[PDB]
Every structure is written in structure tokens, then in C-alpha cells.
Amino acid sequence: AQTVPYGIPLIKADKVQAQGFKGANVKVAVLDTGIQASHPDLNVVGGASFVAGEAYNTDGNGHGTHVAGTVAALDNTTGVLGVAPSVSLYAVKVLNSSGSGSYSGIVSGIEWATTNGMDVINMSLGGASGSTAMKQAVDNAYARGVVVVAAAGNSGNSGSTNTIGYPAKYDSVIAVGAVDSNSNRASFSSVGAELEVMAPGAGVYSTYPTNTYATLNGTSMASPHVAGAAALILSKHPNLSASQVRNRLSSTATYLGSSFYYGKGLINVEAAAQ
């Protein structure tokens, strides 16, 4: 049978899906370690690899497949359920089997995405330092109308230290923090002034390499939740611009506390979709 991860009802992705909007026609590119394209519960329609010696349609890590599953796990009688199960999935490998990648490889992914007409870009990756090349590509995609979502980082908090990584730290990028099934901020969810919105990141069950499913923890899992809500909103009002979709996301979020810890709050797709 098909399992419904707690994450989708928590963010009200089901009320919208129920209304009939599942993110169809929306092109979502997942910049990650690739995707097990042959996964039964997934439907990758294309992409590209910028990692030497590795094809975009294979995931030797499991990370990119899990993230992808959260965005568009097929709505059928098996596996799990994605936020926008009808979204046009694209895998852009910018990380290798060890979860590592170079700035050139990543920006190249951000450039291919925008150039090829992606509506949403998910980056469940992050680093301590940014780069003028990374900033440009990101501001560019956003400038072109591309919604850019990135994991806020998993370095928890310490005193009053802003621990939000890059590219999450960029203004053109939406930073995502993680909360558990009780809607309580996860201990690893980084904090900072740039934290934008919260989504399920603890105990999220999704698709995992070699036709299986696994549970993982991280802000990397919270991100796809927001990347998929964006497509959901886009599949309802396709005329909206990035900044608009973005604003409905944070302007209708459920308040959970100080922005330094929860940003604007937990996202609500039913409210954000008008």
C-alpha cells in the first residue's frame, strides 16, 4: 500500500491536492546527488550531471532520491506520497556519491535549471562560504522568476550565533528550518536572521535507493517540503511571480515563535494557495 508521510498533512498539502492541484506542468529541478530514476515511486523526466563520471539518473548516495521523493513521490498504491506528485521532476547531480560537490558544479546546476525553464529549484545542500558566482546564479534564477529553495543548515544554535549556511543565506534564496511531527523546532535546525520558513525535517520517510524507502533527519528534508508547496501554489495560480509565491509562503505561515528560531513560522499550503 501507499504510505503518507506525516509531513504532507502537517503542511496541508493534502487539502490542496484534494482540491485537484498536484503541481502538474510545474518543472522542479532537484540539485543533489542525483536520483535513482528507475525507482518505482518516482518519475524523473530528465536532468543533467555536472559530476565527472556519474550519470544524473543514478544515486549512489541516497540523499537526492529521498529529497526528490518528498517533492514528487508518485501518487499510486505503493511507496510514499510527495507534496506535488504531478510535478515535472528533473535531477541535476551537483554532488557525488559522498555528498560532496564543487562550486562550479553547483552553479552549473543553477544555470542549467534557469536556462532550461525550471519553475522551482531545490538545494538540500549548504556550505559555510558562498561565492560571487553562486550569488549571481542564484539572484539570476530568482530574477528570472525561478523560486529558489535551500536547506537552512543543520548546525543548531550556540548563544546568538547565526548558523545559517550558503546558499540559504542569500536573499534570493528561501532558507528552510526543520520541525518535527509535533511542529516543534528540531534541535539541529540552524538559526539566524535569514531563516525564512519551517517544514518537516525530523523523521521524514521518503524514497531511498534500490526501490526502497528510508527515514532521514535534516533541514535537507524540510526543503523539499517547501519546494513542493511552491509547485502546488504554482499549479493553482500559474500567473504568480516568484516573489509572490514566496510571499504567500511566509505571509501565511503559522507563527511558532521568534523568527530567529522559526523564521516566519511553519508553512501552510492550504492558506498559501489562496
Binding residues for Ca(2+): 2, 41, 74, 76, 78, 80, 168, 170, 173
CB of 80 to Ca ion, least distance (A): 6
Question: H or E stretch including 107?
Answer: helix 103-115
180 counts as catalytic: no
Residue the block writes with cell 498536484: 22
- What is the C-alpha separation between 108 and 105, in angstroms, rounded? 5
Contacts of 192 (CB under 8 A, 6+ apart): 152, 162, 163, 164, 169, 175, 260
Out of 32, 59, 119, 180, which one is annotated catalytic? 32
Residue 171 grid cell = 536573499
Q: Does residue 100 interact with Ca ion by CB under 5 A?
A: no
CB of 210 to Ca ion, least distance (A): 16
Q: Does residue 79 interact with Ca ion by CB under 5 A?
A: yes
Subset of 252-271 contacting Ca ion (CB under 5 A): none
Q: Does residue 41 interact with Ca ion by CB under 5 A?
A: yes
Closer to Ca ion by Cβ: residue 2 or 210: 2
- What is the C-alpha separation between 94 and 52, in angstroms, rounded? 10
Scanning 33-41, 58-66, 110-118, 210-218 for contacts with Ca ion by CB under 5 A, the matching segment is 33-41
Q: Does residue 2 interact with Ca ion by CB under 5 A?
A: yes
Indicate the burial class of 139 (C-beta count within 10 angstroms; 0-12, 13-18, 19 or more). middle
Question: What residues form DSSP beta bridges with 198?
Answer: 177, 266
Q: Does residue 196 interact with Ca ion by CB under 5 A?
A: no
139 counts as catalytic: no
- What is the C-alpha separation between 211 and 159, in angstroms, rounded? 42
**Is the distance from CB of 51 to CB of 63 less than 8 angstroms?**
no
- Strand 204-208 to strand 195-200: parallel, antiparallel, or no bridges (unpaired)? unpaired
Out of 39, 49, 59, 63, which one is annotated catalytic? 63
Q: Does residue 247 interact with Ca ion by CB under 5 A?
A: no
Binding residues: 2, 41, 74, 76, 78, 80, 168, 170, 173
Closer to Ca ion by Cβ: residue 41 or 119: 41
Out of 88, 220, 223, 235, which one is annotated catalytic? 220
Q: Does residue 39 interact with Ca ion by CB under 5 A?
A: no
Residue 212 grid cell = 526502497
* Residue of 222, 200, 208 lying closest to 79 (CA atoms): 208
- What is the C-alpha separation between 73 and 89, in angstroms, rounded? 10
Closer to Ca ion by Cβ: residue 211 or 252: 211
Residue 236, classed as helix, strand or coil, is coil
Number of residues that bind Ca ion (CB under 5 A): 5
32 counts as catalytic: yes
Site string for Ca ion, 133-172 (x = CB under 5 A): ----------------------------------------
- Active centre residues (catalytic): 32, 63, 220
List residues binding Ca ion (CB under 5 A).
2, 41, 74, 76, 79
